[PDB]
Ligand code: PRO
Ligand SMILES: [Cl-]
């Protein structure tokens with residue numbers, strides 16, 4: 672599913688991401704834009720053989736099981752395919768774990784490089800939230 676901007680903002684808010692670990696909703700929407708272009712089916716192979724899945728490009732080395740990332744963990748206790756669903760619940764639940772891991776949203780390289788310190792409130796402008 673390719674979410675609309677406000678559509679994703681609303682789903683993220685409903686699932687409790689607005690100000691989760693202190694990060695405003697616009698940060699999460701911005702991260703999703705640059706990680707996946709709001710596409711739940713996005714996948715990207717990493718150099719180490721792991722793969723990133725879903726709207727927030729969650730990695731199989733630590734967070735989900737894809738059956739082809741030797742020595743990996745599955746800290747969110749889910750198949751990586753669950754992160755590609757039109758229902759963002761699994762992605763949100765797992766993202767909450769990631770952002771709590773100590774480095775905040777810096778875990779998302781695209782967020783650090785394209786969102787951090789910018790006017791992220793712009794990402795939810797106009798939305799009926
Ligand atoms: O992420 C932000 O910018 C705001 C300020 C602290 C709580 N959320
Ligand atoms: Cl915001």
Ligand SMILES: [Cl-]
Pocket residue numbers: 736737738739740741742743
């Ligand atoms: Cl694996």
Ligand SMILES: [Cl-]
Pocket residue numbers: 780781784785
């Ligand atoms: Cl980047």
